[PDB]
Chain A
């Protein structure tokens, strides 16, 4: 009955991280160390409002 709306294709197509799981694992350990100012915040975002396509920014 209700019609869904999905963001424009160009709303997507942001960036790329292309690496194997292997490198991404240990490198992940270090950035998870220093990064996570944005992404934890992101996790209360898509976790709190949960609607992927709402918080994708």
Chain B
């Protein structure tokens, strides 16, 4: 008969050993640019809302002071 030992048609195809750890492109300083940007949004909006809340504050004190007598 023939022999049943293993090796097949040669090569088993290619195999990739070498190291790969790629792909993060979002990082220049521009990460700072987007974060600091987010701050620049927060202070804008929050500024507005605190102004509004002061307006309400004066209005409430007006309620009280009109009550006082």
Residue of A nearest to B60 (CB): A25
Nearest CB on A from B67, distance (A): 5
B67 touching A24, Cβ below 8 Å:
yes
Interface size on A, residues (CB 8 A): 13
Number of A-B contacts (CB under 8 A): 23
Contacting pair A29 B62 (CB below 8 A): yes
Complex contact B69–A42 (CB within 8 A): yes
Bound: A24/B69 CA distance, A? 12
Count B-side interface residues using an 8 Å CB cutoff. Answer: 7
Q: Is the interface of A mostly helix, strand, loop or mixed?
A: helix
Interface centre among A25, A28, A31, A40 (most CB of B within 10 A): A28
Q: Once bound together, how far apart are the Cα atoms of A39 and B66, in whole Å? A: 10
Q: How far is the CA of A25 from the CA of B21 in the complex (A)?
A: 67
Cβ–Cβ < 8 Å partners of A39 in chain B: 69
**Complexed CA–CA distance, A33 and B63 (Å):** 10
Binary A-proximity of B10-26 (CB < 8 A = 1, otherwise 0): 00000000000000000
What 0/1 pattern do residues 54 to 69 of B give for CB contact below 8 A with A?
Answer: 0000000011011111
A residues near B (Cβ < 8 Å) are 24-26, 28-29, 31-33, 36, 39-40, 42-43
